[PDB]
Each structure stands twice: as C-alpha cells, then as structure tokens.
Amino acid sequence: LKTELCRFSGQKIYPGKGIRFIRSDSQVFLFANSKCKRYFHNRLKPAKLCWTAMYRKQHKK
Amino acid sequence: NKFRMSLGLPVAATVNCADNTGAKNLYIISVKGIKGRLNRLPSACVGDMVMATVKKGKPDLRKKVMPAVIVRQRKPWRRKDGVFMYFEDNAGVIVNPKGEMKGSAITGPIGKECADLWPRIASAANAIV
Amino acid sequence: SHRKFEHPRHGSLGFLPRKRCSRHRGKVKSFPKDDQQKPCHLTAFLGYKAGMTHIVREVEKPGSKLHKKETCEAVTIIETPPLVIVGLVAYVKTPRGLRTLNSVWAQHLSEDVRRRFYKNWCKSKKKAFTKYALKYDSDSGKKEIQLQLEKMKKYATIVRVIAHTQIRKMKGLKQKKAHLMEIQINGGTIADKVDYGYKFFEKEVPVEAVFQKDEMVDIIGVTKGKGYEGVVTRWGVTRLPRKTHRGLRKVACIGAWHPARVSYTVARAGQNGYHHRTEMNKKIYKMGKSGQESHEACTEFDRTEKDITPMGGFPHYGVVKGDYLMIKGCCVGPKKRVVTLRQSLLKQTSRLALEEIKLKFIDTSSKFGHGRFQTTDEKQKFYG
RNA sequence: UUGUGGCAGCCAAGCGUUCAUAGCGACGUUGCUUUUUGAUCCUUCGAUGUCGGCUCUUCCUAUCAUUGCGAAGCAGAAUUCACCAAGUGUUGGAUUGUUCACCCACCAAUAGGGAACGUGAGCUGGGUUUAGACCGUCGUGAGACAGGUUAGUUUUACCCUACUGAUGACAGUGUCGCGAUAGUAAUUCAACCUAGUACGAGAGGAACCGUUGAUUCACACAAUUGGUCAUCGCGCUUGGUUGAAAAGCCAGUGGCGCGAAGCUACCGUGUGCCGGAUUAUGACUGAACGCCUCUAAGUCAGAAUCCAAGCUAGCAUGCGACG
RNA sequence: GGUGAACAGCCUCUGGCCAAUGGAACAAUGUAGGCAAGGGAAGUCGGCAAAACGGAUCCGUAACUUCGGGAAAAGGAUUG
Ligand SMILES: [Mg+2]
Ligand SMILES: [Mg+2]
Ligand SMILES: [Mg+2]
Ligand SMILES: [Mg+2]
Ligand SMILES: [Mg+2]
Ligand SMILES: [Mg+2]
Ligand SMILES: [Mg+2]
Ligand SMILES: [Mg+2]
Ligand SMILES: [Mg+2]
Ligand SMILES: [Mg+2]
Ligand SMILES: [Mg+2]
Ligand SMILES: [Mg+2]
Ligand SMILES: [Mg+2]
Ligand SMILES: [Mg+2]
Ligand SMILES: [Mg+2]
Ligand SMILES: [Mg+2]
Ligand SMILES: [Mg+2]
Ligand SMILES: [Mg+2]
Ligand SMILES: [Mg+2]
Ligand SMILES: [Mg+2]
Ligand SMILES: [Mg+2]
Ligand SMILES: [Mg+2]
Ligand SMILES: [Mg+2]
Ligand SMILES: [Mg+2]
Ligand SMILES: [Mg+2]
Ligand SMILES: [Mg+2]
Ligand SMILES: [Mg+2]
Ligand SMILES: [Mg+2]
C-alpha cells in the first residue's frame, strides 16, 4: 500500500489518516497526529526531541 | 459537484487579499447561495463566493462590496481522501460576478477545491495544492 | 402577537416519549413482507456491536467527483456468532390482529439459553423445560408434537422461528445467559416454512444464510444511556444569555397564558438516551466468516496478515474471534450492546443500492490511543 | 359597538393604441373582520406587575415562496389575476429603547396574523413610571411640561394541577409476542446532460427523465480531526520546606508542554420511507333539451393534501402461545 | 525567616488551631473557578462579563498646552 512519511516524527502514515498543513511558502507538511502538529506549531526542532526518527538517525541509534 | 467541507469564515471575518489587484485585505459580509436559520451567521469555506468590502487597500477599491472567492482557510477540513488538510492564513481573491479573476495572479497556493471549482482562479494560481 | 422571526422546531415530535426503553434487546416492530415465490429464508439476525474502524475504497460512481478516487470511510464491526434455532411459532390472523396459534420447542436446549427463563439462575433447580423435554422420549409425546406441526401447517399464515445467539463464543462479554427472539421466515408456502424450521431445529444458522454482500440492512437496538440530561443537551434549544438570574440552560417561555397548560410539545428536562431506534439503509461491505480467508483483513491490495481485531483488542469489547459484519456508518448503542440486524423493507434500487464495494485497506491501529502501526509484529520489528 | 384602521363584492363612465370586464374600474353602493384608534365604563383600585427585545411552543389564512392547476394585452424568459391548498419555509446586519420605518446582502421567499396587544416567582430594565440633578418655555413663586438629558432595588415556589422523565399494586412466576390508541418528519435548491435546443426576425432563451452534490431539520455514532484534564499520567519550572543529592510535598488545580480514556461538535461522521382515497383542474359515456353537454345516474386522471405503510410509547388498570 | 522595591502576594519557625453535623453517589439546573478549534463584537440598548497589557533595564516618546504637563503616551528590544 501507499504509505506516507510524517515530517516531524519521520514515521510512516497509513491511508486514511494524517494532517497535512500547507504552509504559505507553498510547501506541504504532513503531520502524523495531534502531538507532532502541536510541537511543530510551537516551533520545536524535531532533531532535538528524543523520540523522533530524525533525532535517532542523526545520532545513529 | 463539490462536496461539503468545514465552514470556517463567518461574516465580519477579515481575510488576506491574495492577488495583484492592490487590495490588501477583504472583509466578509455575506455568502452566495446560503439560506439562513435564526441567529446563524453565514459562513464561507474554500471555494465559496462571498461579498466583501476592502478595509485596508488601494483607495479606488474601497467603499463598495465586491464578489470575492475564498482560496485559503485555516480551519482544518476532512478531504474525501481522509486527510485533514488546511493552510496557514485566511485568504481570498477578488472576482467578478461571472467568476472571472479581476486581477492577474494569485500569490501562493490556493485550495484544490477552489481552483477546480473556479475555472479561472485555477489558471491565475501558480501552484495548486 | 405573532413571532417576530420564525425558525424550525427543535427536537422531533415523531420520537416521543423519551423514557428508558422498556427492552434491552432491540425488538423488531415489522418484518419484510412475505413473497411466497422466493425460496424460504430468514429475515433478521442478532449481532453484537464490537467497535468501529475505517477503510479506504475505490469508488465506482460515474458523474461524481469521487469516481476512480479512493475514499476513507468509517465502518462498524458486528461480532455475529451463528444463531441456534430452538423453537417454532405460528401466527394466525384474527379480526383483532395476530394471535400465536401454537409453539414448539427443541428437545435439547443449551445450558445458556435456559438461563433466559430465570431472574436468579444459580439457586434455581434448572427445571425449565425438564418435564417438557420428556415429550420427545415417548410415542404419545412425539405424536402430539407432530400434531402441533400439522396444526401449524394446516392453519398458520405467519411462521416464525425462535433463535438464540451463542453468547458464550463471545468471551468478550461477561455474560452467560442468552438473548432470544423470533425471526420471521419469508418465502415459500406455509408448509414449506414449517418444514424449513422443523428440519433445522437445534442446528446453527450462519449470518451468510441471512444476508449477502453489498446489501443494505437496518440495525435496531437501544441507544447509549446518557442519564437525566437537560434541555439544551436533550432537546437542542439554544442557550440563554450569560447574564440571567437563576440559570441559562433552559427554555424561557414554556407556553402562552392560554392554553393554561404546558403542551406536550414544549421542551422539558428528563431522560436522554437509552431509547429504541431503527436506522435504515446501512450497507454491507464484508462478512467475515471464521475459517475462511475472508476473515482476515487482507484485501486484494493489502496483504499484511492481520485479523480484523485492532491492536490491543477492540476497546471495551475484546478480540473478534467469531463471524462478523462490517457495515458502513455508525451503530446504535455503546460497545457490547446487542443489535438486531433486519432485512430492509423497501425495494433497494438506487445506484447507491446497487453499488458494489471492494476495499483496499482496513485500519487496524490500536483504537485505544493514537495508533500508529498495523500489527504487533510490525511494532516489534520496528522497535527490536 | 366599528365611525376610524384593514379586507372583499355589485353596477359599469372610462383607462387598457380598435375592445367596459386580460388587468383595472371613477360616480355610487353592499358587506366582512376585530391586530389600531375612536366610543362606553360592564369586571377588576384590602394591587391581575404596564413598552420593547431575547427564548420557546402552538394556532389562523385574508397565500410571499414551494407541489398540482386555470386565465392573459401567456411567442420563449419574466411577470400579473385567480383555484384546492396552511404540509414546509420565511434569514445576517448598520441606525433607533422602539413595535413601526429605512437601507445593505443572501435567498425559492425574506407575506401578514393571534394566543390577557402570548411570554418579568422565564431573563433584561434600554424606554417609562418616584425620590438626586441639568437645560428650554410657562409661573412673581412653591412648582408644571403628552419637551430633551443623566444616575436610579426587579423579592418567594418546598403547595395543587399541567408538563417531562422514574418506580409500582391489581390469576403465582418467567420468557416470546399481539397491537387499540396517541404521536409522526422530512424540507428546499443548485450543477452537468437535456441545450445554446424548443420559441423567437433578432435580442434573448426554457422544462420533463437521468446523474451529483448541497441547504434547513431529525435521530444516532466517536474510527478519523478538533475541544476538554485534577488520569494531579508523564516531563519541565518559579517561590518555599524537609542538614544536602534522590524522592516529595505546600501555593484551594502553583504554572506551562503534551496528554490516552470518557463525553463531544454540521467543527467530525452515517442514515432519513413503499400503497391507496381524493381536492383544484382536465376529462369519458350520456341524458334532461332528436343536438350539445365532465353531472343529472355512472366513471377517469389527479397534488408539499388526506389515511394508512414505516418510525416512537404501548398500565389499554386489554389480550395470545408456552415453560 | 525566604522571594521581592515591600507590613503586596506565595511557603516556613515561636504561638494557636483543624471549632464550623456526618455517610454514600457524580443526574439535570445552579453558585465560585478554568479551557476551547475557524471568526473576533456579527451578541447586545451598551464590549455588561471575561480575555489581552502589567515588574525592571535600555531606546523612543506626537497633537495639544496655563509651557508646570501630556508621559508609564505611542512603538520597540532584553530577562533563565
Ligand atoms: Mg485530541
Ligand atoms: Mg437573533
Ligand atoms: Mg411576538
Ligand atoms: Mg410568523
Ligand atoms: Mg446531537
Ligand atoms: Mg440579574
Ligand atoms: Mg480512540
Ligand atoms: Mg368596519
Ligand atoms: Mg372603513
Ligand atoms: Mg374603567
Ligand atoms: Mg385596581
Ligand atoms: Mg399572575
Ligand atoms: Mg383559502
Ligand atoms: Mg408568569
Ligand atoms: Mg433606567
Ligand atoms: Mg427624579
Ligand atoms: Mg421632565
Ligand atoms: Mg395518529
Ligand atoms: Mg480525546
Ligand atoms: Mg533582599
Ligand atoms: Mg510580606
Ligand atoms: Mg474560541
Ligand atoms: Mg458591539
Ligand atoms: Mg442584533
Ligand atoms: Mg451591533
Ligand atoms: Mg443600537
Ligand atoms: Mg468591564
Ligand atoms: Mg494622551
């Protein structure tokens, strides 16, 4: 099936779910759930929340 | 026709004017095709054609109601795909009663169900999404 | 002193009174009409409301924007173990209405149904149907049974079968005693209905016999109970302004000086919820029959070997091990409530009625919390 | 009571480019109604709480829209007059304390009406209608104003009934049913195709069927999104306090970020109904009246109508089968 | 005593109390207090009630003016 990839937790969205924000600079963020979206809007940096796939691959865990 | 999507812009709302006519700010006053109910404020969504005066803009546009079309709204809304899509700012564009874009171009993305519903805002848009 | 401004009435008067339903089981108040030419079949069934999930399907609908497009839809799961037919009733028409002509019961009757006849089973001697069971081990008893059947064949115009669910193959409920009802047979002549029943006593009828795919059914059951709940919630009347002495959430004028009485149509504060309701045209997408590859949630597009139960089980209900239906939309009652599936009464004819469903995906992520995987083994391979 | 207010007839001088009656209809005249006011002063002065708005319900037709029709100065589009029709609908706002009024916009439409000028132990107290105060005119003055202004308490239900819900006795007890009767709920529009067709010189310019959505309403549901936190769940953190780190605790929920579950939202979802009788009208056969005639006898087609079907209750101190 | 500009508030020690009838439950409606997506006065007679601002350091501070004020005007930035 066609999966998606959230752009704040880097985890895979399954069909029929997921919240796509369309930022004024025309680029598409596809959040996974409420928590990712609220951290994004609070301007948190994914690379420095410990639970994110981007943090984990950055530190090679 | 178009499906039903979350209604986000009541009257007295104030939206960006995302086109190159010079108006900086539309002001929603009423919505086409809406039939009311006691106390219920008329509401617009993406693709609904509204009436709007300009409160801050070019001097020669102000002080007169003009048909607008909403192209971006910040209230989420559920697609028929499942995804709850939305935008960053409320914004609409001037049109004429026959749906023509008064201006020439639209700055930024526009609602997909706005462009597909208005055949000219689709061409004046730069990036449909 | 007309009304300055109109607005449509709040609340429907076609659903009064609103008291507790006097029945936990959703009773059927009308069965599909008999058509003697169709072969004999049943017209209802009992299921249990497991929970809700969603699908994405490929719409086939020329003229719609959804044509050749995938749509995400909620669907409700009904865990639906086969009924056991343990009886037979005849109904004969009078100038008053219908009378029960007579009734016949099965020789063996399960432990769990015969609890339906006691308010205190355990202390009882369990003697229900004991001295009636003995009408089958003698020549005279068998004689009078066949006499009852010839009576029903020779007079009755409406034949029904008493069926009970096997409640115990749904360990999710903490309930041992059965639910029991009449399902009215349709089709054939009266002797064929009596033959169809008596042939099929004491044996199990699977929901595939009752329904088919893509068919619309109705679901009948008692709603959620919400308690003694006031007017703004129960009836929907708008709230009063903030600045009122003695409260906001009420109907201000409950009627004119005349009639010097309160009308039955004014909104008052009382019980909300736990009502009886029938809700028609709920479609069938998939019957899951336990023991065939239709039971797992692997479509022809997805193939992740998962069963219908979402991760961590259905909240408040458990894990679906039995048969099940998967119907478009919602279902009355909370989780673990019994729901009567009933064949429709119209002649389904629309493009929606004829529309054929083929899924592509069934959400299985734990409905308890923001689920994010499909399967336990995939959560395990993702962590390590 | 009905002059005054509103509403409808009869006559037909004329308007309606020729043509009284398509649509009017002066001069007269016959009424109807009781939301105004006038008139009276019959009940009420050991008190019936007095304008308006908000809320909610019901009812009326003297019909604005919507379903079916008839007529035209009906070519098509629009529009005007009337018919059975009261089932459904009748809005958001600026200004005013206003009912009234007037504008802007949407709309299929923004018709009119009652219920003690519905509705104050339902609110509000803007107006009015006390005591403070000010101006303008009058008064010599104490003061007056059906002149404008500003501040000015809104008490009680626990009684009976009504109503909305909750138990419940009356052939032992328990399942499964019947169904008298009462309620009843569905409403409207748009887009594509029909079609730039029919009609029309041109300008303009339809509709049925079909297909797709939508509005208003109703009833449910919580997978998805959103809302909610005292899970005091996890984390962060201020001030203090336990010799200190660790673990906490105190600040009535210390504060913030997130926050499952439960409830919940046209802010999310799903669904919303099948026969016959018939009105208005158009008709069939056929008289009276050799002909004609929808009517006299007898029939037909016929609607947002009606009654059922369906949906809700079914202590109707009703009933059936059975254990 | 601590924080703080402080006899503000918030916590503590000496000293004094737990005196305000108790038990069970989490229904409407209340009273006191919170929070809310999109919009921000469209509600309403009237922005009534509530929200937003708020300390301090640095900069900047208009019309008008009795030249004393306006003035903490406005608009900005920093804070562990
Ligand atoms: Mg959430
Ligand atoms: Mg209003
Ligand atoms: Mg009124
Ligand atoms: Mg009215
Ligand atoms: Mg509801
Ligand atoms: Mg008050
Ligand atoms: Mg959940
Ligand atoms: Mg009169
Ligand atoms: Mg008069
Ligand atoms: Mg008098
Ligand atoms: Mg008096
Ligand atoms: Mg009184
Ligand atoms: Mg009439
Ligand atoms: Mg009263
Ligand atoms: Mg006053
Ligand atoms: Mg005074
Ligand atoms: Mg005065
Ligand atoms: Mg009835
Ligand atoms: Mg939640
Ligand atoms: Mg100090
Ligand atoms: Mg101090
Ligand atoms: Mg809010
Ligand atoms: Mg205001
Ligand atoms: Mg208003
Ligand atoms: Mg206003
Ligand atoms: Mg005003
Ligand atoms: Mg204030
Ligand atoms: Mg100043």
PDB file of N, CA and C in Angstrom, chain C residues 45-71:
ATOM      1  N   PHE C  45     -31.457 -11.112  12.353  1.00  0.00           N
ATOM      2  CA  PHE C  45     -30.389 -11.864  12.983  1.00  0.00           C
ATOM      3  C   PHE C  45     -30.000 -11.031  14.204  1.00  0.00           C
ATOM      4  N   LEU C  46     -29.274 -11.626  15.146  1.00  0.00           N
ATOM      5  CA  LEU C  46     -28.715 -10.887  16.278  1.00  0.00           C
ATOM      6  C   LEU C  46     -27.203 -10.820  16.173  1.00  0.00           C
ATOM      7  N   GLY C  47     -26.650  -9.611  16.256  1.00  0.00           N
ATOM      8  CA  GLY C  47     -25.227  -9.422  16.387  1.00  0.00           C
ATOM      9  C   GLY C  47     -24.909  -8.622  17.636  1.00  0.00           C
ATOM     10  N   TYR C  48     -23.623  -8.361  17.829  1.00  0.00           N
ATOM     11  CA  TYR C  48     -23.167  -7.587  18.970  1.00  0.00           C
ATOM     12  C   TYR C  48     -22.197  -6.530  18.478  1.00  0.00           C
ATOM     13  N   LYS C  49     -22.337  -5.311  18.984  1.00  0.00           N
ATOM     14  CA  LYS C  49     -21.569  -4.193  18.458  1.00  0.00           C
ATOM     15  C   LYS C  49     -20.162  -4.252  19.033  1.00  0.00           C
ATOM     16  N   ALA C  50     -19.178  -4.565  18.187  1.00  0.00           N
ATOM     17  CA  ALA C  50     -17.802  -4.698  18.640  1.00  0.00           C
ATOM     18  C   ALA C  50     -17.115  -3.342  18.728  1.00  0.00           C
ATOM     19  N   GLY C  51     -17.049  -2.631  17.612  1.00  0.00           N
ATOM     20  CA  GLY C  51     -16.392  -1.344  17.591  1.00  0.00           C
ATOM     21  C   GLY C  51     -16.331  -0.809  16.177  1.00  0.00           C
ATOM     22  N   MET C  52     -15.670   0.329  16.039  1.00  0.00           N
ATOM     23  CA  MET C  52     -15.587   0.996  14.758  1.00  0.00           C
ATOM     24  C   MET C  52     -14.141   1.079  14.304  1.00  0.00           C
ATOM     25  N   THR C  53     -13.946   0.985  12.995  1.00  0.00           N
ATOM     26  CA  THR C  53     -12.653   1.206  12.353  1.00  0.00           C
ATOM     27  C   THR C  53     -12.939   1.962  11.065  1.00  0.00           C
ATOM     28  N   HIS C  54     -11.969   2.027  10.156  1.00  0.00           N
ATOM     29  CA  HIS C  54     -12.231   2.648   8.868  1.00  0.00           C
ATOM     30  C   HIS C  54     -11.522   1.921   7.743  1.00  0.00           C
ATOM     31  N   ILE C  55     -11.964   2.238   6.529  1.00  0.00           N
ATOM     32  CA  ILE C  55     -11.484   1.650   5.288  1.00  0.00           C
ATOM     33  C   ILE C  55     -11.077   2.766   4.351  1.00  0.00           C
ATOM     34  N   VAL C  56     -10.445   2.402   3.244  1.00  0.00           N
ATOM     35  CA  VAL C  56     -10.379   3.249   2.067  1.00  0.00           C
ATOM     36  C   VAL C  56     -10.760   2.387   0.878  1.00  0.00           C
ATOM     37  N   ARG C  57     -11.757   2.822   0.129  1.00  0.00           N
ATOM     38  CA  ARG C  57     -12.231   2.053  -1.004  1.00  0.00           C
ATOM     39  C   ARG C  57     -12.091   2.857  -2.284  1.00  0.00           C
ATOM     40  N   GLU C  58     -12.307   2.177  -3.395  1.00  0.00           N
ATOM     41  CA  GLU C  58     -12.161   2.752  -4.721  1.00  0.00           C
ATOM     42  C   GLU C  58     -13.560   2.957  -5.283  1.00  0.00           C
ATOM     43  N   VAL C  59     -14.001   4.198  -5.344  1.00  0.00           N
ATOM     44  CA  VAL C  59     -15.384   4.487  -5.691  1.00  0.00           C
ATOM     45  C   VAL C  59     -15.613   4.223  -7.170  1.00  0.00           C
ATOM     46  N   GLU C  60     -16.772   3.665  -7.490  1.00  0.00           N
ATOM     47  CA  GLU C  60     -17.205   3.475  -8.870  1.00  0.00           C
ATOM     48  C   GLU C  60     -18.554   4.169  -9.019  1.00  0.00           C
ATOM     49  N   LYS C  61     -18.531   5.400  -9.505  1.00  0.00           N
ATOM     50  CA  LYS C  61     -19.711   6.244  -9.465  1.00  0.00           C
ATOM     51  C   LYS C  61     -19.634   7.318 -10.534  1.00  0.00           C
ATOM     52  N   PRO C  62     -19.981   7.003 -11.782  1.00  0.00           N
ATOM     53  CA  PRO C  62     -19.879   8.000 -12.853  1.00  0.00           C
ATOM     54  C   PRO C  62     -20.727   9.223 -12.552  1.00  0.00           C
ATOM     55  N   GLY C  63     -20.151  10.398 -12.792  1.00  0.00           N
ATOM     56  CA  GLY C  63     -20.804  11.652 -12.513  1.00  0.00           C
ATOM     57  C   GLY C  63     -20.414  12.288 -11.195  1.00  0.00           C
ATOM     58  N   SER C  64     -19.816  11.531 -10.289  1.00  0.00           N
ATOM     59  CA  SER C  64     -19.353  12.081  -9.028  1.00  0.00           C
ATOM     60  C   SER C  64     -17.892  12.492  -9.128  1.00  0.00           C
ATOM     61  N   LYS C  65     -17.498  13.440  -8.276  1.00  0.00           N
ATOM     62  CA  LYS C  65     -16.083  13.774  -8.201  1.00  0.00           C
ATOM     63  C   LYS C  65     -15.268  12.626  -7.645  1.00  0.00           C
ATOM     64  N   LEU C  66     -15.912  11.692  -6.958  1.00  0.00           N
ATOM     65  CA  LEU C  66     -15.220  10.596  -6.309  1.00  0.00           C
ATOM     66  C   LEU C  66     -14.915   9.456  -7.264  1.00  0.00           C
ATOM     67  N   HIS C  67     -15.293   9.577  -8.534  1.00  0.00           N
ATOM     68  CA  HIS C  67     -15.179   8.461  -9.458  1.00  0.00           C
ATOM     69  C   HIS C  67     -13.710   8.186  -9.752  1.00  0.00           C
ATOM     70  N   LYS C  68     -13.334   6.911  -9.690  1.00  0.00           N
ATOM     71  CA  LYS C  68     -11.943   6.440  -9.721  1.00  0.00           C
ATOM     72  C   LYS C  68     -11.089   7.064  -8.624  1.00  0.00           C
ATOM     73  N   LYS C  69     -11.677   7.447  -7.506  1.00  0.00           N
ATOM     74  CA  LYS C  69     -10.917   8.061  -6.432  1.00  0.00           C
ATOM     75  C   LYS C  69     -11.123   7.262  -5.158  1.00  0.00           C
ATOM     76  N   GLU C  70     -10.105   7.234  -4.307  1.00  0.00           N
ATOM     77  CA  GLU C  70     -10.205   6.493  -3.062  1.00  0.00           C
ATOM     78  C   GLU C  70     -10.847   7.363  -2.001  1.00  0.00           C
ATOM     79  N   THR C  71     -11.745   6.768  -1.233  1.00  0.00           N
ATOM     80  CA  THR C  71     -12.426   7.476  -0.169  1.00  0.00           C
ATOM     81  C   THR C  71     -12.238   6.727   1.136  1.00  0.00           C
TER      82      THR C  71
END
